[PDB]
């Protein structure tokens, strides 16, 4: 649960592209070598800044190239990388969507509110057996995709806009349904019933299924890191970091400030 124990990095390249230097494709890289080799003229320190400079966008588009496609892919989603701004619904969906690209068996459920028992949300409509069997729809790279998933992840709002994480591990011999709250508060009734419904569903295809509330420690003392805490839990659990770390040791908000540089590209 320390920032160096997971696979992310402060790089702005998308997590799935294993490119040594540039996040750009080979065609775009040499097509824009004139602007890439002199970033500090356009007023840029990064590649996402260059291919978003209106003049570079003019050249490559009057040359047929698609720099917007090069920005949606190959790059992490834009967001509060270097500030304590609250994470929007798009900061979270676009994060789990990009995490469905590298992590080929992860289910990126769209963000849900706490009203899912009375309002339709994909979170309350999924069937975890269909998720495991590969019969539920998830949005990866833009297309609708049905694929077998051994992991399930979602981030909900407990209503200001406070984010909490849901992670379902169906990989090992013990299947766990987890609720994480950085504020250390117990899950409300609906989530408390949702996890129990997923337990009975998963007991159809596996003999051991347990529900757990990772709500022991008040990790968050700041007012802004609800998002980074929730996204960090899913990413750490995806990298096989045990939930017992989040149960026993406090992760400071300063590590969540630092984790924001792993999440976004300024835009």
XYZ file of N, CA, C and O in Angstrom, residues 9-13 76-85 256-267:
108
model
N 3.297 4.321 -12.131
C 4.437 5.226 -12.111
C 3.943 6.625 -12.449
O 2.846 6.780 -13.001
N 4.720 7.664 -12.125
C 4.317 9.031 -12.493
C 4.270 9.294 -13.992
O 3.957 10.422 -14.385
N 4.556 8.308 -14.840
C 4.523 8.517 -16.280
C 3.106 8.833 -16.746
O 2.123 8.318 -16.211
N 3.007 9.701 -17.752
C 1.715 10.050 -18.325
C 1.284 9.106 -19.437
O 0.154 9.228 -19.925
N 2.145 8.181 -19.855
C 1.738 7.181 -20.829
C 0.670 6.271 -20.233
O 0.634 6.029 -19.025
N -2.770 8.502 -20.333
C -3.700 8.451 -19.218
C -4.714 9.587 -19.330
O -4.481 10.601 -19.994
N -5.856 9.400 -18.676
C -6.919 10.388 -18.747
C -6.502 11.676 -18.039
O -5.751 11.641 -17.061
N -6.971 12.827 -18.515
C -6.639 14.086 -17.841
C -7.378 14.215 -16.521
O -8.472 13.674 -16.336
N -6.764 14.941 -15.591
C -7.348 15.145 -14.287
C -6.440 15.913 -13.351
O -5.367 16.389 -13.735
N -6.857 16.047 -12.090
C -6.052 16.797 -11.117
C -4.770 16.070 -10.743
O -4.672 15.479 -9.662
N -3.776 16.113 -11.633
C -2.536 15.384 -11.392
C -1.696 16.049 -10.308
O -1.113 15.364 -9.460
N -1.626 17.382 -10.314
C -0.717 18.114 -9.440
C -1.449 19.010 -8.445
O -0.834 19.909 -7.862
N -2.744 18.789 -8.235
C -3.511 19.577 -7.280
C -4.477 18.665 -6.536
O -4.661 17.497 -6.888
N -5.098 19.219 -5.492
C -6.033 18.482 -4.650
C -7.484 18.668 -5.076
O -8.380 18.688 -4.224
N -7.742 18.812 -6.373
C -9.112 18.921 -6.838
C -9.864 17.614 -6.671
O -9.306 16.521 -6.797
N -1.425 9.826 -1.190
C -2.479 9.990 -2.183
C -2.258 11.229 -3.040
O -2.618 11.227 -4.223
N -1.683 12.289 -2.464
C -1.208 13.404 -3.278
C -0.211 12.913 -4.317
O -0.288 13.271 -5.498
N 0.736 12.077 -3.885
C 1.755 11.550 -4.783
C 1.163 10.578 -5.795
O 1.641 10.501 -6.932
N 0.122 9.835 -5.408
C -0.508 8.888 -6.321
C -1.278 9.583 -7.436
O -1.535 8.962 -8.473
N -1.646 10.853 -7.249
C -2.324 11.589 -8.312
C -1.446 11.721 -9.549
O -1.960 11.754 -10.673
N -0.125 11.794 -9.366
C 0.781 11.843 -10.506
C 0.837 10.517 -11.253
O 1.292 10.485 -12.401
N 0.392 9.428 -10.627
C 0.263 8.146 -11.306
C -1.059 8.003 -12.044
O -1.191 7.108 -12.886
N -2.035 8.864 -11.751
C -3.390 8.699 -12.263
C -3.648 9.475 -13.548
O -4.274 8.943 -14.471
N -3.187 10.721 -13.636
C -3.660 11.634 -14.667
C -2.502 12.221 -15.461
O -1.330 12.094 -15.099
N -2.902 12.929 -16.514
C -2.041 13.756 -17.391
C -2.689 15.138 -17.303
O -3.917 15.203 -17.465
N -1.928 16.193 -17.018
C -2.582 17.529 -16.892
C -3.212 17.899 -18.239
O -2.562 17.678 -19.275
N -4.423 18.459 -18.214
C -5.111 18.865 -19.462
C -6.219 19.873 -19.146
O -6.867 20.306 -20.114
